[PDB]
Amino acid sequence: RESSKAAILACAAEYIQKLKETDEANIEKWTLQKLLSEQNASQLASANEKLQEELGNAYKEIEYMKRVLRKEGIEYEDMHTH
Amino acid sequence: RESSKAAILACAAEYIQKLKETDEANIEKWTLQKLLSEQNASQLASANEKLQEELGNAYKEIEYMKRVLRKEGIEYEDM
Amino acid sequence: RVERINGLTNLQKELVTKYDTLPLLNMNLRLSYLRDHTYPHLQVSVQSRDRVHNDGIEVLVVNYKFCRNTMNPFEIQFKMFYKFEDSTLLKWEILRISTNVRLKAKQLLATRNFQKCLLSLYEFDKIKSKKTGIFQNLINLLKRKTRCYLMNNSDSLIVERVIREGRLTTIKLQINFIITMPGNCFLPMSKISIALWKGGERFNQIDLDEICYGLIKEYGVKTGLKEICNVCLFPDMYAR
Amino acid sequence: STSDRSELEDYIVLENVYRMFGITFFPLVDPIDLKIKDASGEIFVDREMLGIRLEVFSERTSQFEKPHYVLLKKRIKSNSWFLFKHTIPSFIDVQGIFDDTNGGLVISHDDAYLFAKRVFLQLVEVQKRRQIFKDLEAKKIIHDLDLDLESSMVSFFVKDIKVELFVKQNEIVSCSILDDIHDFSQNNKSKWEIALLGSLDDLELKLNHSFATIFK
Amino acid sequence: NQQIISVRNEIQELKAGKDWHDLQNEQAKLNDKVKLNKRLNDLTSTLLGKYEGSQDSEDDSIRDDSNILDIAHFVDLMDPYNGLLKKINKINENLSNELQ
Amino acid sequence: LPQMDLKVLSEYSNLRKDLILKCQALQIGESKLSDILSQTNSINSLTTSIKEASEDDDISEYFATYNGKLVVALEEMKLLLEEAVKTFGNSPEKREKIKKILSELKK
Amino acid sequence: NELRLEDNYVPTSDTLVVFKQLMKLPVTVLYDLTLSWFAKFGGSFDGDIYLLTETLDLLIEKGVRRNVIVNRILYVYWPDGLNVFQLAEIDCHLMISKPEKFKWLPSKALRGDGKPYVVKLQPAKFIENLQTDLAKIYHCHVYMFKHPSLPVLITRIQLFDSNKPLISRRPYYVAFPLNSPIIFHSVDKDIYARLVLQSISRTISERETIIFKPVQKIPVKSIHNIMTLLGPSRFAESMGPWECYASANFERSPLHDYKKHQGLTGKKVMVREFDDSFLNDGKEEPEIRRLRLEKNMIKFKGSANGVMSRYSSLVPIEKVGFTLKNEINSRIITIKLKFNGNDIFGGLHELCDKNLINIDKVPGWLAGENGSFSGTIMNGDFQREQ
Amino acid sequence: YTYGLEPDGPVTFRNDSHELNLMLNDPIKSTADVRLDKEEVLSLLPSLKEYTKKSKELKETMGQMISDSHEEEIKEVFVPHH
Amino acid sequence: QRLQILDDAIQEKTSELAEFENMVRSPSAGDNAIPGLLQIIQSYINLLEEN
Secondary structure, eight states: OOSSHHHHHHHHHHHHHHHHHHHHHHHHHHHHHHHHHHHHHHHHHHHHHHHHHHHHHHHHHHHHHHHHHHHHTOOOOOTTTO | OOSSHHHHHHHHHHHHHHHHHHHHHHHHHHHHHHHHHHHHHHHHHHHHHHHHHHHHHHHHHHHHHHHHHHHHTOOOOOO | OEEEEOTTSOHHHHHHTOOSOSOOOOHHHHHHIIIIIISTTEEEEEEEEEEETTTTEEEEEEEEEEOSSSSSOOEEEEEEEEESSSOOEEEEEEEEEOGGGHHHHHHHHHSSOHHHHHHHHHHHHHHHHHHHHHHHHHHHHHTTTSEEEEETTTTEEEEEEEEESSSEEEEEEEEEEEEEOOOOOSSOEEEEEEEEEETTEEOOHHHHHHHHHHHHHHHOSHHHHHHHHHHTTOHHHHHO | OOHHHHHHHHHHHHHHHHHTTSEEEEEOOOGGGEEEOOSSSOEEESSOEEEEEEOOEETTTTEEOOOEEEEEEEOSSSSOEEEEEEOOOTTSOHHHHHHHGGGSOOOSHHHHHHHHHHHHHHHHHHHHHHHHHHHHHHHTSSOOOOOOTTSOEEEEESSSSEEEEEESSSSEEEEEEOOOOTTOOHHHHHHHHHHHOBOSTTHHHHHHHHHHHTTO | OHHHHHHHHHHHHHHTOHHHHHHHHHHHHHHHHHHHHHHHHHHHHHHHTSSOOOOSSOOOOSOOTHHHHHHHHHHHHTOTTTOHHHHHHHHHHHHHHHOO | OOOOOHHHHHHHHHHHHHHHHHHHHHHHHHHHHHHHHHHHHHHHHHHHHHHHHHSSSOOHHHHHHHHHHHHHHHHHHHHHHHHHHHHOOOHHHHHHHHHHHHHHHHO | OOOSOOTTOOOOOOHHHHHHHHHHSOHHHHHHHHHHHHHHHOOSOSSOHHHHHHHHHHHHHTTOOHHHHHHHIIIIISSSOOOHHHHHHHHHHHHHHOGGGOEEEEEEEEETTTEEOOOOOOTTHHHHHHHHHHHTTSEEEEEEEEOSSSSOEEEEEEEEEOOOOOEEOOOEEEEEOSSOSEEEEOOOOSTTHHHHHHHHHHHHHSSSOEEEEESOSSOEEOHHHHHHHHSSSTTTTOOGGGHHHHTTOSSOOTTSOSSSSHHHHOEEEEOOOSSOOSSOOOOOOHHHHHHHHHHHHHHHHSSSSOOOOTTOOSSOOSEEEEEEEEESSSSEEEEEEEEESSOHHHHHHHHHHTTSSOSSSOOHHHHTTTTTOOOEEETTEEOOOO | OOSSOOOHHHHHHHHHHHHHTEEOOOOOOOOSSOOOOSHHHHHHOHHHHHHHHHHHHHHHHHHHHHHHHTHHHHHHHHOOOO | OHHHHHHHHHHHHHHHHHHHHHHHOOOOOTTTHHHHHHHHHHHHHHHHHHO
């Protein structure tokens, strides 16, 4: 707020210009966020699928151990039951 | 462009108000889209960490399977 | 009219006749403000108030109790002599000090200033409570996922995870919080450090210090510790 | 009766014990914000206000110094306090600390305590340096000295030479010797100020050690 | 003289500009971020076992954190007041009082 | 200071190298000295605690027979617990001992 | 560049103007300056110090009129002219004698974006750098003197022109408090005002850019009063009704006795009517009259006794203009108030004593709070004028 | 946080640092592409090597007494943690 | 000069650390007795759990 007329006019012009550049910065930042969100989503999906296939391989190894022990014929116990 | 100064000032005021309103609307819609994206990321990460916990349990199981055969002492042939 | 008010008067009657900027006279309200808000979990008790009529010296015994930790609180008793009409402190001494805090309190009580000792003790208790809360949060987050055990008497935390890329490899990460009592400044202080072992081989200390300092500075301590516990413990998932 | 005098005295004793800590919150209301809704003749405050007391103990004087008051008022359109009035001198920027604390937007008494603590440490720093300088003056290792309101600038004579010090905080960050005895070498000038650089607490021992070798 | 004063005022205003300070701070922050990202990538590569930069063995003795931990633990164990033997003793008299 | 006939160029470059290296050595000197001061406070507090609690101004025999004090206390505690268990289940005594151990772990 | 002036240059100042400067100074101070003047630069008197101090003592013995001794020091001791150092001495002594005749304006020093910069002025280093920065353009001569009863360091700067003797211009005074970002300087709008003030900012910084921002636009006299108003003191930011907090006399030390604590004694108060009975109007009781008169003093002086006839405030101010903006029915209502006088807040106090103004409904800013600052008020918050 | 549409991290860190009186090992300032060497720094201050040797001896010394005390066994048998 | 003064200050501190180290050293062989007592305490804890 200014009491002088010319000061009011100059401040109005500066405010209008600042609003314009603020809008430009806002749209640029919106584009950047739009890129970042999809990048993160794709990375997380790839991580999830890789970790799931690792789990599948672990289950296959567990089955291999299990029927190797069954071939050996020794009695078996499960720690989720103990 | 206008001739009378009063029209110039009124148009400047309307321009300022329109710019502020447009900025507010854009912020609101972008915030809504941000919320949707965050929800999607969280809901996928929950399943990711759950299956990671399952994987850790499976690793504990396979570690116990490995240490069973050394207690008994039968030789093991790797794949 | 003309009304007479004092400390014991009702709050409403004092508000009716309030036309100055002086602090309120309601002593109950002042005590509540000093107890519930300024210094929570501090049970103070003025044990007695004795006098020596020959020299005008007042004897006061004050007992302090810190109740931030429900189990094992540490209490300290203070005795001080000050002149009656002149606000000068003659001498003060510690009548008794709790054993569980005596070592960390000796060097602080060596300095001849009661105010510094009280402030340092209160801040030390607050920092200990904060550290315990952080440890509880981290344990609850990392429990039932990796095998973790706590030692150094609640000073360091060790987390162990078995990561397999076709063979058994264990990654060991140590996080420790150190609280050192001054005895520069007069307030208790804390320090952060990390140490990572990957299957028996120790990582370079400079780069780990840099990563810890970074993540903590740009993410805070609460989220920074969680981020640190992610990257070393689960490097495979972040790589994809 | 006289009993209410007794528990009023007890409450005052407890309040003084609390004031021994040095940081306290006290209630405050301004007469202009008091209004009556006229529903039942009830008086309610419009804008809440909180006051903070800061007292610093001086070991040299064995007396409590004059308290400093800072007051916080609540905005109408927001739930955040703003710095209404204060008595802290100008050389301490209370407004800068208020904006620094939580990036502004103080909402809880825990956040308000942190702001009051930060401004409290600098007050003790001012007193400690003045106390050390006055202790040196009493010990008479140095001559008459001049001190500003923050005890940063100082100038005194050790034996006959003008030595002045600049301190940003407890550590001495600058030294100078501003006298020309007609037996002095420039090499000796540098090796003395560098030695004198250090903390404020070891100045007493160092002044005796450095200036006893010159007259031996 | 008028232009001398004007140009000197312009010097002062340009050198004391807020945008200049903001740009300096932004440059410093971005350099710090770049360095942190590079070090994070190096650490992740080292942990995964591929593209090693060094980081597999300790080479610095200028900073060892474990000294303070070891001495603090020793102080805690050797406490005349809160030591292990003092705790065991207090257990002894507690049991004696419980069963007298 | 920015780095910059080869006479002064080379000597100035290496001297600037040497001086920036020296000052970074000085600030790591702050690191070393601060760590040493804090650790000295720790060790001095321990030794003065034991020295005031010794009452005879030497602790060599204290360190020597610390372990012996341990074992004797433990195995007499063994007979104490054996008698208590024989006398009764001592649920309250067991709870008190567990709470005391928890307090010891806390501090 | 030997454009600087030594302490022996003799400008061709008029005899009449320097005659009027010695007019205002008392007799007892003229004797002191003359003795010190001869000990530094001598004079045309054909005698030693003892001979000079003998005859000068005799002028006191006879009760000699000051016009004789003023003519003696202007036409006998120094007929040729007056030294620049002598002119500086008479100017500073007139400054001390009549501190109400000089006006001052506040200015703030800023470093970086918005961090205030506290000034630490070295009496020596601040001189030569200013001389170097000023003599490259114009002839420069400076003089520094410390206030006898105030911590400020008043500096006077005079600039000379060639149009051959040099022609003196109007001196520029800049007052430096010990440790405060606020710097008080005199009022001037000439070629020399923007050349002296700008040179000071570059000189005092010496490591980083420092800019000066005018805090106020209305000058205030009485350099003693401006220090309490804006300098480093407890009374700043706690004026008006809150002056009781500046001098913590209402609260005792925690170590002090607790019977004298005002909790036991309490305070004597009167009930204020929240219903509007001021518009319509019975003779008041003298006790009620005393309490009614006490309410007015509490809200303008801060205490029943008064921090400081009785209507004079702590710091008198000349012109303050407020602007009140409020939102009613989704539109802004603006009221502008302009005050003019000798003591604005003292004048409002008297009108409240004559029952012309209700004392309950006056706001804080009208009562003296954040005085000497005029600006817009919204939502109960005061904003200073940009 | 920095370049997106919506600084919470740095603010929280500053709050925590002022709350807990935290220290962090500040890295050596930007040397403008100058590598921090080690062996000549150690040679410049041989007291560093002396302190390193003394601290190594101290750490080796405490370990034997810690093992002899068998304090960890008593703590484990008294209170288990998981 | 500054580095030299820092160096001998650190040297004095290292001398103090060495004088402290020269006192704690002592031979001990009670580890077996401590382990036996720990086994007895484990049996005692089992008995208490039974009780």
